[PDB]
Design a binder for this molecule. Structure first.
Ligand SMILES: O=c1ccn([C@H]2C[C@H](O)[C@@H](COP(=O)(O)O)O2)c(=O)[nH]1
Ligand SMILES: O=c1ccn([C@H]2C[C@H](O)[C@@H](COP(=O)(O)O)O2)c(=O)[nH]1
Ligand SMILES: O=c1ccn([C@H]2C[C@H](O)[C@@H](COP(=O)(O)O)O2)c(=O)[nH]1
Lengths: 139, 135, 146
């Protein structure tokens, strides 16, 4: 199942629109679009802009997830993972990276920093009740 | 088209105010609100479990995901330690949010603070097919 | 509910039971450590733990590697690249990247439950490049908004 998503390139965008590595990949690589280098000191969190804004169709969301390689090699991961991009968000997509490694890490424009996976969500209608069914799991 | 799924929800004794709400009509998730009666300090490097005051019964083939909110992470280094937390359709206990302070100042969690977002989605039940060669 | 068949290969270090759902309505299966030498995760360190299985997902399905809440609560151990993303293109050994954000060193021994694996559908995006996106209510009137 294919979904069309509108996407706007911002002033800082470069290159191809976010790409899937292979034809069956779940996620697109997000690329740092910071106009000046950003150093993430050990233990710190930095916001990295991506230079895109998107308009997801109704009932969909985008998830900002880590690239395993950055975590393995440098202890860099997504601080709010999985980051939720809502279908009515019209701002620049931002990636929050934390440095949990042992050396300061420089984020340069063009680096692959996260992946973005699009998935369906369901909107909840609450049915308030005073008792829930019992299950084999329980409380 | 969005689709609606009805989910049963029980208020526990420590719930205050309103059932979890979508910030906007097109939000993927509902905001989860701290329901601790007494403030909870999360010191630098600590993990703390925060109650929400609710229990839910998801319909079959659905799960709920406990995810961080952007503000707590970027402003305070607070995030969800077991993210994304998985709420199973047969869980009948209180939903709790496990926060970690990876920032550089102690942070006090007060009743009423938005501490996470909860996204409901379908999952698929796997039947394994054992094989000797993956194509 | 909806059942999906997934092919799975036992590698040489596989010990015993294929990943199982803890209950008939659990979203995820428990993944178990299959390391043939003990692995110590020092405080603040990150270690890759093998599971001894490889899988072949059907198209449009992913497996998400997520933390078990018990390990996080009791030991500060969680999944460093969470949610780990397994898709149809990955037929190698499933590995769990753990980080120790607790207050003492933690030894991973084979047979320990280390993560849970939730299979779900994802969508493939085709981009419609545009110069004007619709306006919405989100963030409207906030400080600094243009
Ligand atoms: O990693 C993230 C998370 C969120 N957002 C955007 C899209 C969301 O709709 C909006 C609000 O996020 P929350 O505060 O609800 O997490 O910020 C990002 O750009 N990056
Ligand atoms: O962030 C979380 C994760 C889990 N749970 C509840 C619902 C789950 O069904 C149950 C068991 O979680 P695990 O041990 O499978 O992580 O705990 C929560 O309240 N919050
Ligand atoms: O928790 C994880 C995440 C990924 N992978 C597999 C599937 C991916 O295709 C491959 C490389 O990881 P990424 O660089 O795409 O994150 O490793 C795992 O074994 N476990």
């Amino acid at each position: 199942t294919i979904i069309e998503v509108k996407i706007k390139k911002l002033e800082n965008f470069l290159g191809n629109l976010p790409e899937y590595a292979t034809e069956h990949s779940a996620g697109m690589d997000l690329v740092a679009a910071n106009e000046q280098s950003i150093t993430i000191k050990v233990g710190s969190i930095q916001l990295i802009p991506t230079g895109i804004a998107i308009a997801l169709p109704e009932s969909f969301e985008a998830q900002i997830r880590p690239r395993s390689g950055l975590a393995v090699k440098h202890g860099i991961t997504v601080a709010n993972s999985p980051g939720t991009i809502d279908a009515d968000y019209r701002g620049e997509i931002k990636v929050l990276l934390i440095n949990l490694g042992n050396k300061d890490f420089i984020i340069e424009k063009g680096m692959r920093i996260a992946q973005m996976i699009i998935a369906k969500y369901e909107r909840v209608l609450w049915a308030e009740t005073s008792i829930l069914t019992e299950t084999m799991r329980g409380r």
